[PDB]
Amino acid sequence: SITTWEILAVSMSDKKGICVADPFEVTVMQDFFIDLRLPYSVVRNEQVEIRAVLYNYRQNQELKVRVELLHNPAFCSLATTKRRHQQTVTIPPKSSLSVPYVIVPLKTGLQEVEVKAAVYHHFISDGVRKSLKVVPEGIRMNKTVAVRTLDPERLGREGVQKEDIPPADLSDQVPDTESETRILLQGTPVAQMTEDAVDAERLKHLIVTPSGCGEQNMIGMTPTVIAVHYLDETEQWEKFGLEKRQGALELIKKGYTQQLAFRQPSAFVKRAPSTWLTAYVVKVF
Amino acid sequence: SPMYSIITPNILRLESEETMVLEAHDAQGDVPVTVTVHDFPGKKLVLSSEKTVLTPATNHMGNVTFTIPANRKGRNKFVTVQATFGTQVVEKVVLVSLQSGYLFIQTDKTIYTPGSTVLYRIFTVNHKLLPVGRTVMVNIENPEGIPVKQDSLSSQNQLGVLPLSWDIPELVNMGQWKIRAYYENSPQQVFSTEFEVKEYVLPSFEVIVEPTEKFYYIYNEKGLEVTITARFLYGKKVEGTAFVIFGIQDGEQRISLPESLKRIPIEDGSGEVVLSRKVLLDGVQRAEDLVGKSLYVSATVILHSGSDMVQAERSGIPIVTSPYQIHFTKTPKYFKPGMPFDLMVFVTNPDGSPAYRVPVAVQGEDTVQSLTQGDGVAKLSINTHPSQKPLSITVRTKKQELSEAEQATRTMQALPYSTVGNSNNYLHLSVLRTELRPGETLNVNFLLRMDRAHEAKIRYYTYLIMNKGRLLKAGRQVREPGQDLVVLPLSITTDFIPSFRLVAYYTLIGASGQREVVADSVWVDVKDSCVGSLVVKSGQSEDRQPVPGQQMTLKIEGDHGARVVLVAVDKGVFVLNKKNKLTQSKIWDVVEKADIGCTPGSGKDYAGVFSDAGLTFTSSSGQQTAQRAELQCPQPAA
Amino acid sequence: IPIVTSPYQIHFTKTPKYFKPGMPFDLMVFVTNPDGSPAYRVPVAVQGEDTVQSLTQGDGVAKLSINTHPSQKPLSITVRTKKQELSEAEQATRTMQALPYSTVGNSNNYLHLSVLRTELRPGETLNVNFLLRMDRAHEAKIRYYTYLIMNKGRLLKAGRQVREPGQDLVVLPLSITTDFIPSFRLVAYYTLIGASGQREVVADSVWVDVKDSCV
Amino acid sequence: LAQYQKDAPDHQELNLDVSLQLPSRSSKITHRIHWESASLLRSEETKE
Numbered sequence A: 001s002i003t004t005w006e007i008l009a010v011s012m013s014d015k016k017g018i019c020v021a022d023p024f025e026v027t028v029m030q031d032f033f034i035d036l037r038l039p040y041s042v043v044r045n046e047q048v049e050i051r052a053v054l055y056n057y058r059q060n061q062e063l064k065v066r067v068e069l070l071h072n073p074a075f076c077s078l079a080t081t082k083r084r085h086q087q088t089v090t091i092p093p094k095s096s097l098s099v100p101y102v103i104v105p106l107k108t109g110l111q112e113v114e115v116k117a118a119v120y121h122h123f124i125s126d127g128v129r130k131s132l133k134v135v136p137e138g139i140r141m142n143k144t145v146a147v148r149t150l151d152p153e154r155l156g157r158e159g160v161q162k163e164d165i166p167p168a169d170l171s172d173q174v175p176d177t178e179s180e181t182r183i184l185l186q187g188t189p190v191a192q193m194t195e196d197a198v199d200a201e202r203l204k205h206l207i208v209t210p211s212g213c214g215e216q217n218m219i220g221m222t223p224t225v226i227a228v229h230y231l232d233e234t235e236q237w238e239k240f241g242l243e244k245r246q247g248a249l250e251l252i253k254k255g256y257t258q259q260l261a262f263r264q265p266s267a268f269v270k271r272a273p274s275t276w277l278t279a280y281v282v283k284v285f
Numbered sequence B: 001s002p003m004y005s006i007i008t009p010n011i012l013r014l015e016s017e018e019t020m021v022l023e024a025h026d027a028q029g030d031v032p033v034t035v036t037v038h039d040f041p042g043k044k045l046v047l048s049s050e051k052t053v054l055t056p057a058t059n060h061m062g063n064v065t066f067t068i069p070a071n072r073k074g075r076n077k078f079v080t081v082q083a084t085f086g087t088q089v090v091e092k093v094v095l096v097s098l099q100s101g102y103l104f105i106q107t108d109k110t111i112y113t114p115g116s117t118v119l120y121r122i123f124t125v126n127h128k129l130l131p132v133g134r135t136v137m138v139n140i141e142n143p144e145g146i147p148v149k150q151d152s153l154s155s156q157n158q159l160g161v162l163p164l165s166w167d168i169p170e171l172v173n174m175g176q177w178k179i180r181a182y183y184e185n186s187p188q189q190v191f192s193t194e195f196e197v198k199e200y201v202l203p204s205f206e207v208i209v210e211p212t213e214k215f216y217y218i219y220n221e222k223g224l225e226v227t228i229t230a231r232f233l234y235g236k237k238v239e240g241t242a243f244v245i246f247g248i249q250d251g252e253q254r255i256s257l258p259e260s261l262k263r264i265p266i267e268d269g270s271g272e273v274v275l276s277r278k279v280l281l282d283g284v285q286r287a288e289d290l291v292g293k294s295l296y297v298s299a300t301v302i303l304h305s306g307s308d309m310v311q312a313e314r315s316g317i318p319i320v321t322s323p324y325q326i327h328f329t330k331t332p333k334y335f336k337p338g339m340p341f342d343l344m345v346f347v348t349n350p351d352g353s354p355a356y357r358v359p360v361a362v363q364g365e366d367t368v369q370s371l372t373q374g375d376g377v378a379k380l381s382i383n384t385h386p387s388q389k390p391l392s393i394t395v396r397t398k399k400q401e402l403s404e405a406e407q408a409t410r411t412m413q414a415l416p417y418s419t420v421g422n423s424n425n426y427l428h429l430s431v432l433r434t435e436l437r438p439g440e441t442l443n444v445n446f447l448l449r450m451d452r453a454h455e456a457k458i459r460y461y462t463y464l465i466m467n468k469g470r471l472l473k474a475g476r477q478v479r480e481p482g483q484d485l486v487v488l489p490l491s492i493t494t495d496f497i498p499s500f501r502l503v504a505y506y507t508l509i510g511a512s513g514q515r516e517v518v519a520d521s522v523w524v525d526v527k528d529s530c531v532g533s534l535v536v537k538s539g540q541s542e543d544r545q546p547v548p549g550q551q552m553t554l555k556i557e558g559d560h561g562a563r564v565v566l567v568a569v570d571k572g573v574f575v576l577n578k579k580n581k582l583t584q585s586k587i588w589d590v591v592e593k594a595d596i597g598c599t600p601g602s603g604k605d606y607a608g609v610f611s612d613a614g615l616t617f618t619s620s621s622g623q624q625t626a627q628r629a630e631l632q633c634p635q636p637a638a
Numbered sequence C: 001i002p003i004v005t006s007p008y009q010i011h012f013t014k015t016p017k018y019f020k021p022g023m024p025f026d027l028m029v030f031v032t033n034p035d036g037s038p039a040y041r042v043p044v045a046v047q048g049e050d051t052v053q054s055l056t057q058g059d060g061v062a063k064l065s066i067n068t069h070p071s072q073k074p075l076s077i078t079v080r081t082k083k084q085e086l087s088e089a090e091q092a093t094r095t096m097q098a099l100p101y102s103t104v105g106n107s108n109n110y111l112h113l114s115v116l117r118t119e120l121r122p123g124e125t126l127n128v129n130f131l132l133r134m135d136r137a138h139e140a141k142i143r144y145y146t147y148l149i150m151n152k153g154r155l156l157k158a159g160r161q162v163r164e165p166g167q168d169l170v171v172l173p174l175s176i177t178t179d180f181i182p183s184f185r186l187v188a189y190y191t192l193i194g195a196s197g198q199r200e201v202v203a204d205s206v207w208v209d210v211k212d213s214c215v
Numbered sequence D: 001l002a003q004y005q006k007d008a009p010d011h012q013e014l015n016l017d018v019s020l021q022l023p024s025r026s027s028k029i030t031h032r033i034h035w036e037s038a039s040l041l042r043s044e045e046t047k048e
């Protein structure tokens, strides 16, 4: 390729990390050459014209050029197996010259066009052997096979929804062409439904410091315990104050310790054991 | 009164080493310190290790490097740091990020034809840009956002480089394709790079459209002058004819100007086209209205041989009343009452690129002036009064050759530093702002501000370094009684790149047996370049241009032990598409966006200075910072 | 071609021979090759402070700064080149002696002018720092500084720098033109009444080098 | 109210087990669309 390349470098060091180097350009040129320009794709049997530009970048030396289009059974031009289609044009110094070439693709597939040219007196030359895709006569399209909903729980009752899928008829598909079928599975999830909890922003009093006797200590520990349990399952500690939770855990643990000072061998230790109080202790604990 | 403080990054990260600065003020002898981290809420013990002792030989400063494992919605998750200094325990809750690192996708070409193969590499690195071995999930979506291929390779022992390839079928939709990759440990964070698919053919020459000015003055009689430069890929000049047109853009909508269509010849590989102001105004139906909109040029060169054809386009030409723009995005929004406030004026051209050599000043003080450096930042400094009233500053460009009407102005508002209990104790950090380069040394100035009644109590400053979202370094700056200004010889290495912050604070007892903390932060920009170095030049230290098929030596100057991946592409390809490439500048742009700091420096109070710099302060006395529970920085509220 | 034992030489010819007691003293290390031409990129430091460092610029001058005590005793400084690849034996050293600024009647009133020394270029602006040093008993008397500019042996300019009570550091936005070339000096002084109804004058001068190019 | 949050559903149950039997019938095909991933668009291509 007669052009300017751009080299990109990337270093990956475990000491200096990643680093993208500045692009380095390399110009590759020649005093004389051919720029055979072929279209991306050419329709079979269709006669088209291809350009062949011959560049001459000599200081002050117009070149007597002899350009020839090599024969190829895949194409139909003036050049045959026993006949050479060669012109003899002249190119001014520091300029270019286009050379027309009529051809007709005969067989599909990646074919090959080749042109060569040499100058008289000067011992220079350059041939170009590029390849162009030869596509038949057709047009892109994406016919929709089918679009149905898949839900065994709803459609088809039973529990194992089945679905018959007809193939693509494509009655108008150009012979000798490929075609792919794509299956797409997509989940259509529908969330929602969760009645909000307490604002909490205006609920900063449940953090009561447990104190008192046996039952008085529980009444003060009740709000704090259930408060943390509620804020944990609602993750509302952000709007309430994260650095406030630590002050709550201490009050809960403090209430637990104070309640141990009233654990009979089984309110006041001097008093007979209560059935309800003991049962409630289990609930909170 | 032994004061045990602790400082950690404002936002912690998973599978990465985050530093943690331990301390102990007015402490005697040694002190066993035990750092522990638990999940929130409850207790699961993500990390119990990492314990150290604060020795009086180190001014009682600790250093514990920890790492938070994985062991995996919409609501952020937090962790509870717990530092126990012997018996006294101090804990603080910090936000956690699911981002494990960055991913960079590189494709050989920018545009591909149906039938060819796409060669793409995935670079896997951490927050420190250092290579890492992880599991990566790579997908490829079509123009209509539909995945077609998905891989699951690992950069394990691959040196953070994942070479891949995919063949594009002949039967496929053309347009914009996308390659999306993400770490297996963070599905929410996805990186993507686009490559266009189109039936094309590499041209033989490029076309450049450069307007004389990188903008357009509404009151410019001459009009928008545009130059059409066309040259072959091999450098040689191009002879042909070009078709140039104009138009106005509005957000996403474009309005072509049929009466601006020109057909100028292209001699010597150059062309000249002009868009008269007459036609421009006639394009609409209030010149001051077009202000803000943009103009786009669309050229189309055709050789005199009619063999090849190229279409170029320049878009984004701003229509403004002023050749400049001023931004206070690099200037702290908080000043110290009665102390020199530094203004980092950021002058830039209408396009976005920094403006070099453009004098600026303040509303008053006609005498005060300052030119803009190569980075686009000017150095200004003003004296403030001991007033607790907000300071309003208006900076005005003073570039000659123009008029007071063509100048661009901008106004900001700085707020006084709220001191603890109105004790009027401040701390200012003035930095000699010049283009810092890895290897030089920086003179960090520490200016104290407090009555002599307690000035003898201050004997040291605690400074910390922020870099890429991690604590680079932290030390102490000695101070003797009677010194208001002390310099800190801070050597700049290759780590400070790109930008590094510097927070400094001191703590003492005064006023009325009340603990007080005063801090000040500053953000400095270092020259943006590769952490190391990588150069690629011609091996042949002589000769001219090669010939197709000829060999050539290719010298590569990089760091030792480093692996280098190469790729060569015909420039003709970039003529069709030059977007979505990979540049070192684009890398730093991403790293900077992932910064946890959201303020050029300073803050409303001591708890604000740390938070606005990406840090969290917590002491045994009670002085802590503002709770942060939001990933992204403050929503840019203009 | 010089035959010497150290590839470098140190000169304190660009460093003031007088320091302000208890104030940051600036050291302009002038490293040069054995021949005489300035040496580029050669780290230097002081006897102590192993951590302190500074590289040499293109002019052959390094930027050093040290903190002194309120002692009226002479300050001895030894600067040592710290260029790697060599040894402590191949390094060149030099020692100088700075004397404290004698204040009128021993009133201990000083004035320091610290300049951000970088290669000054006609068009830029210089931040002239004014650091005051005196008891608060008379600090409220100082309200302005009288600075003068020296250039090629003539007075280029002279003005006043305002100062409010309680300010130990004020900056002077001094714009550099094509006149300052090559080198320009800057003297600053203030006068007031104190101690015992006695007149006192305190001054401080500084010599800065501007880029050497055509006017 | 706290328990009401734990036993909360959010309306969902994407346990779909779709199978595909094309004439290529030489092996088998089975893709499962569970929650979390779910939306994940699984696709299959056949040149025939």
Ligand SMILES: *[C@@H]1O[C@H](CO)[C@@H](O[C@@H]2O[C@H](CO)[C@@H](O[C@@H]3O[C@H](CO[C@@H]4O[C@H](CO[C@@H]5O[C@H](CO)[C@@H](O)[C@H](O)[C@@H]5O)[C@@H](O)[C@H](O)[C@@H]4O)[C@@H](O)[C@H](O)[C@@H]3O)[C@H](O)[C@H]2NC(C)=O)[C@H](O)[C@H]1NC(C)=O
Pocket: C156, C157, C158, C159
């Ligand atoms: C030491 O002595 C120096 C010489 O006297 C002083 O230098 C002058 O200082 C000023 C301020 O820095 C210089 O800068 C400016 O001058 C220009 C204008 O051009 C000038 O015209 C002046 C005025 O003549 C008349 O003024 C009256 C009153 O307004 C008008 O009615 C009349 O129409 C006309 O304007 C001259 O006096 C003048 O100097 C220039 O010829 C002005 O635009 C700026 O605002 C500013 O004044 C000025 O050029 C200096 N003079 C020179 C260089 O010749 C210096 O102030 C003083 N200080 C020291 C120590 O340097």
Ligand SMILES: *[C@@H]1O[C@H](CO)[C@@H](O[C@@H]2O[C@H](CO)[C@@H](O[C@@H]3O[C@H](CO[C@@H]4O[C@H](CO)[C@@H](O)[C@H](O)[C@@H]4O)[C@@H](O)[C@H](O)[C@@H]3O)[C@H](O)[C@H]2NC(C)=O)[C@H](O)[C@H]1NC(C)=O
Pocket: A142, B143, B144, B173, B175
């Ligand atoms: C399945 O079949 C459909 C139908 O052929 C294919 O859709 C076509 O595909 C291409 C690529 O997605 C679409 O190109 C886009 O065109 C849009 C819109 O058209 C525009 O219309 C407005 C208003 O009239 C104007 O801007 C123009 O007239 C323009 O034509 C354009 O905005 C985009 O730039 C883009 O190129 C095309 O729209 C679309 N044709 C339709 C829907 O009729 C589809 O590709 C194919 N593939 C599959 C499997 O879906």
Ligand SMILES: *[C@H]1O[C@H](CO)[C@@H](O[C@@H]2O[C@H](CO)[C@@H](O[C@@H]3O[C@H](CO[C@@H]4O[C@H](CO)[C@@H](O)[C@H](O)[C@@H]4O)[C@@H](O)[C@H](O)[C@@H]3O)[C@H](O)[C@H]2NC(C)=O)[C@H](O)[C@H]1NC(C)=O
Pocket: B019, B062, B063, B471, B472, B473, B474, B475
């Ligand atoms: C918080 O702690 C960290 C970690 O300790 C400190 O950061 C700096 O870490 C480097 C580690 O490379 C230390 O310097 C290194 O020294 C090693 C040689 O190993 C050590 O040698 C010394 C001297 O005998 C011993 O004390 C050690 O036990 C060990 O043998 C060398 O190979 C490296 O190249 C490097 O020079 C350095 O000690 C330390 N810097 C200091 C002192 O501040 C640092 O204390 C602090 N860091 C932060 C983030 O604030």
